[PDB]
Design a protein around this ligand. Structure first.
Ligand SMILES: O=C1N(Cc2ccc(CO)cc2)[C@H](Cc2ccccc2)[C@H](O)[C@@H](O)[C@@H](Cc2ccccc2)N1Cc1ccc(CO)cc1
Lengths: 99, 99
């Protein structure tokens, strides 16, 4: 749909059998989810944000359904205050900025 | 214009007589700029991010021009690694997202 930005742009995702809400986030390069059960292998890493760095686990190749579109990608799981969908998935879903 | 998200969506801003680049960031409610000299006076404020929180100072009713577009609003100046344009200014330049 279009999304105006008068409100936080939130979306429903399904990942790992579970339903969550997530913020559409053009300023983020990667997707970062609050701590969640995912099956599998993962490799740790750090990301920095505004505020310092977190240590996060990266899982590659995770299927997310976002709104109702499907994507496979890397997601990072860690101590974020909100789930963010970053540009690595935004580009799969077809998301564009318009002004 | 329309901006796809294969690369970081940067724009040039003009703010307080200085030219800078910033990320159009849908995830951020407000605009946070790296430290720079701005006139007026300000209030101490604290925002949270990934990583944690920073003390910023808030200036309100500053004019910023983002592409050719003027907007006036609150800008937080402080320890961000990257100048971030958030939703408070994005709505004024008529930015939407679309998928
Ligand atoms: O740290 C934030 N990252 C950091 C970030 C970096 C990398 C990834 C994964 O690759 C994910 C998130 C982004 C801004 C930023 C970009 C580049 C360098 C440094 C910072 C993001 O784009 C912004 O949306 C929120 C993400 C967020 C969303 C909801 C809740 C917490 C964090 N933030 C924090 C932020 C908070 C408030 C304001 C102003 O109100 C601005 C930014």
């Amino acid at each position: 749909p279009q999304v105006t930005l008068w409100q936080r742009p939130l979306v429903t995702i399904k990942i790992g059998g579970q339903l969550k809400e997530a913020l559409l986030d053009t300023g983020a390069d990667d997707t970062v989810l609050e701590e969640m059960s995912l099956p599998g292998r993962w490799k740790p890493k750090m990301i920095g944000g505004i505020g310092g760095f977190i240590k996060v686990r990266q899982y590659d190749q995770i299927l997310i359904e976002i709104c109702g579109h499907k994507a496979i990608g890397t997601v990072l799981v860690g101590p974020t205050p909100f789930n963010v969908i970053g540009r690595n998935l935004l580009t799969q879903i077809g998301c564009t900025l318009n002004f």
